[PDB]
Design a binder for this molecule. Sequence first.
Ligand SMILES: Fc1cnc2[nH]ccc2c1
Ligand SMILES: Fc1cnc2[nH]ccc2c1
Ligand SMILES: [Cl-]
Ligand SMILES: [Mg+2]
Ligand SMILES: [Mg+2]
Ligand SMILES: [Mg+2]
Ligand SMILES: [Mg+2]
Lengths: 194, 194
Amino acid sequence: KQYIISEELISEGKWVKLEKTTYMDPTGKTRTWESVKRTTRKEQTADGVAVIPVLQRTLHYECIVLVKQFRPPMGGYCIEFPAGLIDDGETPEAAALRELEEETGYKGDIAECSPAVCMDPGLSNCTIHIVTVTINGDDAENARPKPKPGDGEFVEVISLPKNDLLQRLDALVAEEHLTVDARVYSYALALKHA
Amino acid sequence: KQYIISEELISEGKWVKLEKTTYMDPTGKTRTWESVKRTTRKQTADGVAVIPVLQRTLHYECIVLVKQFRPPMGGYCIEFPAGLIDDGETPEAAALRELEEETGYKGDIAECSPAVCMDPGLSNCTIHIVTVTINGDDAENARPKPKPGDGEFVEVISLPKNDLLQRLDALVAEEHLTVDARVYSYALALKHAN
Ligand SMILES: Fc1cnc2[nH]ccc2c1
Ligand SMILES: Fc1cnc2[nH]ccc2c1
Ligand SMILES: [Cl-]
Ligand SMILES: [Mg+2]
Ligand SMILES: [Mg+2]
Ligand SMILES: [Mg+2]
Ligand SMILES: [Mg+2]
């Protein structure tokens, strides 16, 4: 029923644009929306990847590997899945494995790759692939893993037991000023609910 | 170690603003970020998202999701029922209200998250994730009357919790829909718990 009529640029930065979207509602009436988009999306099937990194080690419980970073939009530290934009010509799986190694030092193995999923569809067109990666914590390559942060990247690694992830995130929130990412929190909720 | 120095307003619309954020990186170097904010927060968070567990005896538990045209995506998205919290509203109250407006279901609070970020590399947008059970056997949830607001057009989609990820992958495959990242993340953890 509904579809886009026009997209009028309002403001274009180096990294983000604001657009006036005109669309048809299902009563057949024209309406508008203020839509955010990134300037960085070329041919990619999504803007970015988030990595669900499952650290597996003999005689350890499986951990989920998370990163803590200062996020200027938030004015604060945030706990998120390892994540980055897809380079032009890069696959989602390549991007995921590269961002995981850059942000954590860990060398993962692809397990699965989502279709493009929407970050905040009432605000932005922004999409990711959610890529599940296993990390063989028994491999010597993954022994004392060194982050390789790019210019202006500063990442802390936090590995939390999958079997207690939600209470471990609650304990971190209830111990300092920091926001858990909605996707990390949804994943931790589902681990409890299953 | 890192913090906000100042925010420059680049562009304000009715619903969304684009800010140039100046921040101190940990090296002591000043850096700039293009940051999206809503104009609507007063508020624990911008929004609530409801994980509604529809419980009917002798049936599979279902997760209640909504399909909506999302102008920023230029297409239909599958999402947790969700909306912005009114000035003076509690996150819990917004949750039960948005759930009835969007689904017609009347539900009970199980748990409420702290504020979680939607896309902290882009925006300051946060939500409370609110887990709600729906007694599908109660008369008030027999023929649920969804009460949409002005310009809302929401289709209800109940999916079995125990097969959620395969069911969502199927809708994507054969309906060209975008699944929301928090829905997909929840659906992944339901599978990864085992
Ligand atoms: F009616 C509107 C139009 N554009 C928007 N962008 C974010 C919320 C919103 C509501
Ligand atoms: F380096 C930057 C600066 N501002 C940004 N806004 C979104 C991504 C990004 C990267
Ligand atoms: Cl529940
Ligand atoms: Mg990153
Ligand atoms: Mg990165
Ligand atoms: Mg809504
Ligand atoms: Mg609503």
